[PDB]
Each structure stands twice: as structure tokens, then as C-alpha cells.
Design a protein around this ligand. Structure first.
Ligand SMILES: NC(=O)c1ccc[n+]([C@@H]2O[C@H](COP(=O)([O-])OP(=O)(O)OC[C@H]3O[C@@H](n4cnc5c(N)ncnc54)[C@H](OP(=O)(O)O)[C@@H]3O)[C@@H](O)[C@H]2O)c1
Ligand SMILES: CC(=O)[C@H]1CC[C@H]2[C@@H]3CCC4=CC(=O)CC[C@]4(C)[C@H]3CC[C@]12C
Length: 325
């Protein structure tokens, strides 16, 4: 309202600017994928300028319609929306990268994405199934050199189909593999990974900072907690007593504390909500600040709780979460 023409962004290592608060669009299987349309419209209306999705989420038709609808009605311009998609692991083969991006863009009915990520570093066999399995129920993994996948990502950026390219769920070793690649043209702008006060990623964050790679935090509110992907006996982040005490002190909410913690440590933070009140609330992250002693307290919550292990993909050497970081 006073001035919605400006918003907080960070400069990426390719010269583009990423808004530091992103809207998460994934919703669990029981929610119809038609509900994404209204939520993204509300997010844009509330002041979200970064919107995160993926081929895998099966929502790109709805997400794209929401964005085009808010442009067509004058609420926002394309250049003031930062839209992220992701390449699913059935399309890591380098010949399949551009086809997967074009398919996303066709669903979205947008001419480009602002950011395209390698979704998850374990490759699976190509085909229409997102999770291909053999007669024994075993996932059919694929042997793909991610360096060759990255080259294909770079060509997407050169063709203008993605303004920026980055990675997701990469560990130290995998990031170094890309950074040391022969003939590297574009460093990844970001590594999008799980990050919240119970798994604050300080080692991986500092490695990213040392390379001017932005860490983008997912499940920053403690995740969707969807079974079987998240164990229901994992601790509920937003019931943490230090977060709740800080929220009460600031007259905010635990969610807001968790989001603000990320902003102050130089992380770009995602937040999914399909609720009008919570969508609005989340944008209050820009209205208050945490002191150094509050930030120290939150750092003290770190406790090795990874909600999303994605261990259905464990086994191959690119499985990213068996290394320390
Ligand atoms: N790269 C990847 O592999 C990957 C993996 C996971 C996620 N992501 C991305 O990151 C996004 C966020 O992660 P997430 O989906 O795990 O969820 P998340 O943002 O951590 O949030 C989880 C929950 O918080 C609730 N919530 C939101 N605002 C709240 C508030 N102010 N107070 C209380 N509760 C609040 C939501 O419910 P309500 O909706 O009911 O408000 C939602 O169930 C995803 O949607 C996706 O875009 C990426
Ligand atoms: C965003 C997220 O947490 C990811 C991690 C694992 C992903 C799921 C993995 C299994 C899967 C297979 C499908 O066929 C539909 C999408 C789903 C149900 C995925 C939805 C998005 C998930 C839940």
C-alpha cells in the first residue's frame, strides 16, 4: 500500500534479482490441484513476488493461469513475478532437459521461467512415469552424468527459456562437481534445500555463501508433513517453545519467527499456505526484526531433524543426504 512498486530482493551471481520471500505451491494429494489457482492469486495480491513450483507438483497449469490472470487484470507485471520450475529426475538425460522445460512452459502458457532447477540429483529412467518401478516394485534408477544435464540447463538459459538456472537438494560434493566442471558456463544461482531451525544447514549455507550461491529454504515452516514423505512422529517445528516465546514477545507468530530467522541469515525463504489469512500473515516478515541474541537462540534449536529424507531414492551415489553435508 504505501509503496508496492518495490520489494526486497537479492542479487544472484548471474546478475538477476530474486525476491527474498517466495510462495510455495505444493499441496498434498488429497487437495484438488485446482486449489492452487486461488492460492497463487491470493499470494500475488498479498505481495508475494516469487512463486515456486515444479513439474512434479502437477499444478503448473493452475499456477500459470493465476499469474497470467493477475497480469491481465493489472495487478502485477511479468517482470515483477519471479517464477521457478524444476526438472524432474525422469528428464536428467541431456537430450530430455529442454523438452521438459518446454512442456512446463506449455502448461504454464508463459514464454520463460525466471528460474529452472535440477529438482533432485538421483536420476530415474525416462518415460511418462515420474517414479518408474520394475516388476519387483523397485525404482528404476538411471545412470546420468549431471554435468551433462547442467550443460543442457545452460543451453536453456542461453535460449532464454530460463532466465537463471540452479539446483535443488545438492550436497557439497555435487555442488563442487558442477562448479569444477570442464567448460562451466553458468554457476548455479541457488541450491534449494530443506532449511529451518531444527535443520539450519549452517555448513552447507556457508559453503554456498563462499561461492556466491544463494541457499533457498524449503519446508522452512516445518514441511507439509504429508505421509509417507514425512514421519508423523517428527517434532512439529511450529510448536517449538523458543519460537513460540519469541513470537509472543514480538506479537507475531512462530511461523513469522522461522521466516525472519532465514531472511536475517541471508537465506531466501519459501512459505506454502493455501489459507488467505496465513498467506497475508507470512508477508509480515518484512515488518519486524530479530536481535542478535534472538538469532543466537534460534541457532541453538538446531537438532538434525530432516523432515524430507526422500529415502525412496537412496542407494545411488548421487543420493545427497548420506554425506555430512
Ligand atoms: N525442492 C524440493 O525438493 C522441494 C521439496 C519440498 C518443498 N519445496 C517447495 O517449498 C515449499 C514449502 O515447503 P512445504 O511445502 O514443505 O511447506 P512449508 O512452507 O514448510 O509449510 C508447511 C505448512 O505451514 C502452514 N502454514 C503456512 N503459514 C503458516 C502460518 N503463518 N502459521 C501456521 N502455519 C502455516 C501450511 O498450511 P496452510 O496451508 O494450511 O496455511 C503448510 O502446511 C513447497 O510448497 C515447494 O514449493 C521444494
Ligand atoms: C515437494 C515434496 O515434498 C516432494 C517430495 C517427494 C514428492 C512426491 C514423490 C512421489 C510422488 C509421486 C507421484 O506420482 C506424484 C507426486 C508425488 C506424490 C510427489 C509430490 C511432491 C513430493 C512430496
Amino acid at each position: 500500500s504505501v509503496d508496492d512498486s518495490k520489494y526486497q530482493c537479492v542479487k544472484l551471481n548471474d546478475g538477476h534479482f530474486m525476491p527474498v520471500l517466495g510462495f510455495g505451491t505444493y499441496a498434498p494429494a488429497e487437495v484438488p490441484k485446482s486449489k492452487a489457482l486461488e492460492a497463487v492469486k491470493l499470494a500475488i495480491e498479498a505481495g508475494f513476488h516469487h512463486i515456486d513450483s515444479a513439474h512434479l507438483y502437477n499444478n503448473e497449469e493452475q499456477v500459470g493461469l493465476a499469474i497470467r490472470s493477475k497480469i491481465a487484470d493489472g495487478s502485477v507485471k511479468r517482470e515483477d513475478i519471479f517464477y521457478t520450475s524444476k526438472l524432474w529426475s525422469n528428464s536428467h538425460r541431456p537430450e530430455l532437459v529442454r523438452p521438459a522445460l518446454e512442456r512446463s512452459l506449455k502448461n504454464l502458457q508463459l514464454d520463460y521461467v525466471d528460474l529452472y532447477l535440477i529438482h533432485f540429483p538421483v536420476s530415474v529412467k525416462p518415460g511418462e512415469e515420474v517414479i518408474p518401478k520394475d516388476e519387483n516394485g523397485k525404482i528404476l534408477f538411471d545412470t546420468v552424468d549431471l554435468c551433462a544435464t547442467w550443460e543442457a540447463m545452460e543451453k536453456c538459459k542461453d535460449a532464454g527459456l530460463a532466465k537463471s538456472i540452479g539446483v535443488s537438494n545438492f550436497n557439497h560434493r555435487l555442488l563442487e562437481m558442477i562448479l569444477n566442471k570442464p567448460g562451466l558456463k553458468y554457476k548455479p544461482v541457488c541450491n534449494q534445500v530443506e532449511c529451518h531451525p531444527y535443520f539450519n544447514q549452517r555448513k552447507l549455507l556457508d559453503f554456498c555463501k563462499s561461492k556466491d550461491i544463494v541457499l533457498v529454504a524449503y519446508s522452512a515452516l516445518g514441511s507439509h508433513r504429508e505421509e509417507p514423505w514425512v514421519d508423523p512422529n517428527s517434532p512439529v517445528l511450529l510448536e517449538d517453545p523458543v519460537l513460540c516465546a519469541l513470537a509472543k514477545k514480538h506479537k507475531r507468530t512462530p511461523a513469522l519467527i522461522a521466516l525472519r530467522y532465514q531472511l536475517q541469515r541471508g537465506v531466501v525463504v519459501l512459505a506454502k499456505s493455501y489459507n488467505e489469512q496465513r498467506i497475508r500473515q507470512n508477508v509480515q516478515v518484512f515488518e519486524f526484526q530479530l536481535t542478535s541474541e534472538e538469532m543466537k537462540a534460534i541457532d541453538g534449536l538446531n537438532r538434525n531433524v530432516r523432515y524430507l529424507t526422500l529415502d525412496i531414492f537412496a542407494g545411488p551415489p548421487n543420493y545427497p543426504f548420506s554425506d555430512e553435508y
